Amino acid sequence: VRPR
Amino acid sequence: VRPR
Amino acid sequence: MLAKDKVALLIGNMNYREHPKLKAPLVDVYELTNLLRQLDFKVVSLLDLTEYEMRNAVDEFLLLLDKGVYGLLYYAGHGYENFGNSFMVPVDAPNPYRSENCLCVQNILKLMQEKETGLNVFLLDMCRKRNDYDDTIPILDALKVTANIVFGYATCQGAEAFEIQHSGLANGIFMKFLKDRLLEDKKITVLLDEVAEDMGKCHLTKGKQALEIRSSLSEKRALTDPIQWAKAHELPESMCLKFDCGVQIQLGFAAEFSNVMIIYTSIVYKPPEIIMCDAYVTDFPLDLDIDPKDANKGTPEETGSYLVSKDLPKHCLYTRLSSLQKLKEHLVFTVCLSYQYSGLEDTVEDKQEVNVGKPLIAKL
Amino acid sequence: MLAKDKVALLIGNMNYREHPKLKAPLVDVYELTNLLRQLDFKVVSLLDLTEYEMRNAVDEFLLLLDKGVYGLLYYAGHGYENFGNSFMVPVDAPNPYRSENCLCVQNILKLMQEKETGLNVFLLDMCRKRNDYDDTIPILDALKVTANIVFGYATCQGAEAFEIQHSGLANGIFMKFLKDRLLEDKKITVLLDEVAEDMGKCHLTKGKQALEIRSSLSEKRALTDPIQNLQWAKAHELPESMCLKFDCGVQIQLGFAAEFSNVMIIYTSIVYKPPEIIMCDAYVTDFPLDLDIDPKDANKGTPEETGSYLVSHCLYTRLSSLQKLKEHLVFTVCLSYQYSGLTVEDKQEVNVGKPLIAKLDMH
Ligand SMILES: [Mg+2]
Ligand SMILES: [Mg+2]
Structure with a gap:
């Protein structure tokens, strides 16, 4: 996953 | 009214 | 769930x-x-x-x-x-x-x-x-x-x-x-x-x-x-105290909050030889900061309780003990009795200490 | 309510x-x-x-x-x-x-x-x-x-x-x-x-x-x-498609599609070619520098090649950054062609005004  |  | x-x-x-x-x-x-x-x-x-x-x-x-x-x-x-x-x-x-x-x-x-x-x-x-x-x-x-x-x-x-x-x-x-x-x-x-x-x-x-x-x-x-809780909600049981002269006084307890208890007293037996008697509670631990002008009231309402007369037995004297969390030692107090024998002129005074341990939240 | x-x-x-x-x-x-x-x-x-x-x-x-x-x-x-x-x-x-x-x-x-x-x-x-x-x-x-x-x-x-x-x-x-x-x-x-x-x-x-x-x-x-x-409403209305006719008889359709209020896709295609002309290609160029377009990215045979994935036989160009436009969107449609009996170059400048978010005149 990629965090914002 | 009475504030808390 | x-x-x-x-x-x-x-x-x-x-x-x-x-x-x-x-x-x-x-x-x-x-x-x-x-x-x-x-x-x-x-x-x-x-x-x-x-x-x-x-x-x-x-x-x-x-x-x-x-x-x-x-x-x-x-x-x-x-x-x-x-x-x-x-x-x-x-x-x-x-x-x-x-x-x-x-x-x-x-x-x-x-x-x-x-x-x-x-x-x-x-x-x-x-x-x-x-x-x-x-x-x-x-x-x-x-x-x-x-x-x-x-x-x-x-x-x-x-x-x-x-x-x-x-x-x-x-x-x-x-x-x-x-x-x-x-x-x-x-x-x-x-x-x-x-x-x-x-x-x-x-x-x-x-x-x-x-x-x-x-x-x-x-x-x-x-x-x-x-x-x-478990040990935090223990209430003393009703007890009947007998004085030397034969008078019996019932002492009851009611929980209002975990740190507020009401005590009430009433005469449940008076020998006929005794014309009149009054029982009241005094000498509570200083930690509880009870004022005696506020104790021994004819109604629960007068002690500042949430409980009303319909919540408790009637015709007693009521005392509110708040701040129970401040109690360091046992809850000891005195039940006093005044009375007088028919045919005698002097009022007699007696008293007994009662120790009900550490009630409600006082149990720690 | x-x-x-x-x-x-x-x-x-x-x-x-x-x-x-x-x-x-x-x-x-x-x-x-x-x-x-x-x-x-x-x-x-x-x-x-x-x-x-x-x-x-x-x-x-x-x-x-x-x-x-x-x-x-x-x-x-x-x-x-x-x-x-x-x-x-x-x-x-x-x-x-x-x-x-x-x-x-x-x-x-x-x-x-x-x-x-x-x-x-x-x-x-x-x-x-x-x-x-x-x-x-x-x-x-x-x-x-x-x-x-x-x-x-x-x-x-x-x-x-x-x-x-x-x-x-x-x-x-x-x-x-x-x-x-x-x-x-x-x-x-x-x-x-x-x-x-x-x-x-x-x-x-x-x-x-x-x-x-x-x-x-x-x-x-x-x-x-x-x-x-009215302007907020107009900020999501695309320019109408247009059919450019060039001197030589070739006509090119110019169409628009919206992705966002600040992102528009332009596409071109040849819609009519005279028999005289054996082949022609049209492409878009000379966009306002404020848009910051790269030409290797423009005029692609596919929308996804421009990074436009929500679009669907034309050439496609993605104009992102319309919010940076301070004047009219003006650009050139270039045409190259040849007549049976040998290459020519013509062009037509187009002005589509203030497209989409440019309608708000945020500047
Ligand atoms: Mg509804
Ligand atoms: Mg700043």
């Missing part, structure tokens, strides 16, 4: 030494206690706690929390909110006061999460204005995402929460509406959302007080979910 | 100059734009905005707000939160950045309340960790108690909000679940409560991301509420 257990700590602060006194927390706490007990919660209800006593109460509350347990905290009293953090102000706070004199709600939440609770509910019935005399900018660690936290704030950030000026046994505003919804079998978030709409119709507070709900609860948990 | 109007501003920031780039804000904003328009919201959607551009967009949005209007802001991009104040990070933010580089959501809420809106909704699809470089402790005025404010945060305070790596046109986590509930005719708080439960079933984000709802809304208001200015 299931709860391992359901535990609640209710605190109502009124008798502030250095700030305006409140009145409705008494009623608010009493009534929420009864509703939560109907929902099968273990409930500790405490009035008028100092900073030290509030921290102790929270510590005891945390002991009752374990994996899967639902924990609820309700607080009615002075409060404030600085830089995202809510603080509860104890009755011994100075004026002005700072965060050091108060309990931060986020710190309690952190401790509850560490117990792996199944649900954390905070019902904060207090003002949320900033404390400009509080220059502390404490950073707490980020909370874990446990997706099981619900806050019901009586009012919004930067606003006040109210009770009615001069209004007998009326509830504060928040409890006025919460009480009529609390028993519903609905997710606690939905329940509070209903309460917010009910409060929205209260003309007295439109523009001044509105409920705020904050929730990360991602399961359908409710205060009604089935379950699938 | 009734709205005087329903207005939304949606911003998706992805192409960060100095911070990790994102991917899903594009599809997240596009899909939410479409859903809100189904609910009769007047929506402006914008991608990849600088601080100045974000402030201008917010100003335009605030101008459309008035008594009883429902106003909604959705933001997907980098963000942070210090002491309960949430900040949105523009694509031109330096590294490191601080509060002066960002927009504070609470400041926007205060301005919305001043317009006496009937409903204020903030959907914040961003991380909420502290920015350690921001040591400011600003005190904003206490907000009035208008009892009509709802925040749907994609994640909790101190935590991250996610999208999926290598996931094509998949939504971010928040929108993945929000999109399936948004059309429900229910109070907005209840709708979000449902979304939180849906997200609670997402294994990918267990222990990392959970919706937070904050609400003081004390009336049963919903995004579906009945409604009971």
Whole structure:
């Protein structure tokens, strides 16, 4: 996953 | 009214 | 959804030494206690706690929390909110006061999460204005995402929460509406959302007080979910004391809060040879700060109790012992008896000491 | 309950100059734009905005707000939160950045309340960790108690909000679940409560991301509420297709498609070629430098080759950054051709005025  |  | 257990700590602060006194927390706490007990919660209800006593109460509350347990905290009293953090102000706070004199709600939440609770509910019935005399900018660690936290704030950030000026046994505003919804079998978030709409119709507070709900609860948990203290609620048993002269005096006890007990006395046997007798209680531990002008009343109402005459046996003398948490040693007091023999002219006085150990929250 | 109007501003920031780039804000904003328009919201959607551009967009949005209007802001991009104040990070933010580089959501809420809106909704699809470089402790005025404010945060305070790596046109986590509930005719708080439960079933984000709802809304208001200015409307109207006729007889169709209020696709094709001319090709060039187009990216045989994935025998050119246009969109259509009996070059300049977001004259 990629965090914002 | 009475504030808390 | 299931709860391992359901535990609640209710605190109502009124008798502030250095700030305006409140009145409705008494009623608010009493009534929420009864509703939560109907929902099968273990409930500790405490009035008028100092900073030290509030921290102790929270510590005891945390002991009752374990994996899967639902924990609820309700607080009615002075409060404030600085830089995202809510603080509860104890009755011994100075004026002005700072965060050091108060309990931060986020710190309690952190401790509850560490117990792996199944649900954390905070019902904060207090003002949320900033404390400009509080220059502390404490950073707490980020909370874990446990997706099981619900806050019901009586009012919004930067606003006040109210009770009615001069209004007998009326509830504060928040409890006025919460009480009529609390028993519903609905997710606690939905329940509070209903309460917010009910409060929205209260003309007295439109523009001044509105409920705020904050929730990360991602399961359908409710205060009604089935379950699938102990030494803190022990009351002395009724006892009948016999005096040398043969008079028998019944001494009864009633719990009003976890730190408030009512004692009442009545004559249950008087020898006919004795024309008249009176029994009364005196010499309570100084820690409880009982004033004798306030004890031995003909009605419970006169002791400042929430309980009314219909709640207790009639025709007794009533004495209210509050601040039981302050009791260091055993609760020892004296029952005095005055009497006089028919045909004799002198009043005789007798007395007996009674030791009922450490009752209710005093048991520690 | 009734709205005087329903207005939304949606911003998706992805192409960060100095911070990790994102991917899903594009599809997240596009899909939410479409859903809100189904609910009769007047929506402006914008991608990849600088601080100045974000402030201008917010100003335009605030101008459309008035008594009883429902106003909604959705933001997907980098963000942070210090002491309960949430900040949105523009694509031109330096590294490191601080509060002066960002927009504070609470400041926007205060301005919305001043317009006496009937409903204020903030959907914040961003991380909420502290920015350690921001040591400011600003005190904003206490907000009035208008009892009509709802925040749907994609994640909790101190935590991250996610999208999926290598996931094509998949939504971010928040929108993945929000999109399936948004059309429900229910109070907005209840709708979000449902979304939180849906997200609670997402294994990918267990222990990392959970919706937070904050609400003081004390009336049963919903995004579906009945409604009971011209420029905001025109800001989503594309230029009409045009059929250019060149001297030599060749005619070229010029068409337009919208992705966002600041992103338009232009496509060209040959629609008629005289028998005289054996072959011809047309292409677009000489766009305003303010748009910052790259020619290796223009005039592609496919929309996806321009990075346009939501479009569907032409050549396609993606004009992102229409918000940077300060004059008319003028450009050249070049034609090359040959007559049986041997190459010629002609061209025609086209002016499509102020397309889409340029209608707001934000500058
Ligand atoms: Mg700036
Ligand atoms: Mg409806």
